[PDB]
Amino acid sequence: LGSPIGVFWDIENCSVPSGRSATAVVQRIREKFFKGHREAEFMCVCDISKENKEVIQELNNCQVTVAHINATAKNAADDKLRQSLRRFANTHTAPATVVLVSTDVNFAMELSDLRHRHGFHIILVHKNEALLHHANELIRFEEFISDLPHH
């Protein structure tokens, strides 16, 4: 009902296929999820020195925040995703929707907090049960990267 939505994208693990339009992936996510909502956040975490520069430019043209971390710390991206989920939850109240685009079961408890103590609607976009259990909705990441337009 005009409730806020935040998208948090683990793009290291749910990546855009080589040669394909990241713009189209972002468009598909927004088309699937954003009707009736106000966008509070749409962010991905990555080490931009590892990522395809054209993909990153597409993301910035699509107004997806590209939060840079140094991936030589193996838990840096996961930590930043957790912190961003929590920051979203810190100043919004139910009703609100979190879309986590990740397959990292490491987020289980985060989602539990968001579901139980914050009362948020949780959509997990994953590649595939402990992680799935706390989500309200489970969507396969594949539908957002299948048969994409090519560069």
Residue numbers in the entry: 349 to 476, 480 to 502
From the paper:
Meiosis arrest female 1 (MARF1) is a cytoplasmic RNA binding protein that is essential for meiotic progression of mouse oocytes, in part by limiting retrotransposon expression. Human MARF1 contains a NYN-like domain, two RRMs and eight LOTUS domains. Thus, MARF1 post-transcriptionally represses gene expression by serving as both an endoribonuclease and as a platform that recruits the DCP1:DCP2 decapping complex to targeted mRNAs.
To gain structural insights into the MARF1 NYN domain, we crystallized a human MARF1 protein construct encompassing amino acid residues 352–500 and determined its structure at a resolution of 1.7 Å by single-wavelength anomalous diffraction. Although the NYN domain crystallized as a dimer in the asymmetric unit of the crystal, both the wild-type NYN domain and the mutated protein used for crystallization (I391M/L457M) are monomeric in solution, as determined by size exclusion chromatography. The MARF1 NYN domain consists of a central six-stranded parallel beta-sheet flanked by pairs of alpha-helices on both sides, in contrast to the previously determined structure of the NYN domain of Bacillus subtilis YacP/Rae1, whose central beta-sheet contains only five strand. Despite lack of extensive sequence conservation, the MARF1 NYN domain exhibits substantial structural similarity to canonical PIN domains of ribonucleases MCPIP1 (39) and SMG6 (40), superimposing with root-mean-square deviations of 3.0 Å (over 96 Cα atoms) and 3.4 Å (94 Cα atoms), respectively. A prominent feature of the molecular surface of the MARF1 NYN domain is a highly conserved negatively charged patch formed by Asp358, Asp426, Asp427 and Asp452. Similar clusters of acidic amino acids define the active sites of PIN domain ribonucleases, including SMG6 and MCPIP1, in which they coordinate a divalent metal ion that in turn coordinates the substrate RNA and activates a water molecule for nucleophilic attack on the scissile phosphodiester group. Importantly, these amino acids are strictly conserved in MARF1 orthologs and map to equivalent residues in the SMG6 and MCPIP1 domain structures. Crucially these residues are not present in the SMG5 PIN domain, which has been shown to lack RNase activity. Together, these structural observations strongly suggest that the MARF1 NYN domain is a catalytically competent ribonuclease. In order to determine whether residues in the active site pocket are important for NYN enzymatic activity, we generated a NYN mutant in which Asp426 and 427 were mutated in tandem to alanines (NYNMUT). The nuclease activity of NYNMUT was strongly reduced as compared to NYNWT.
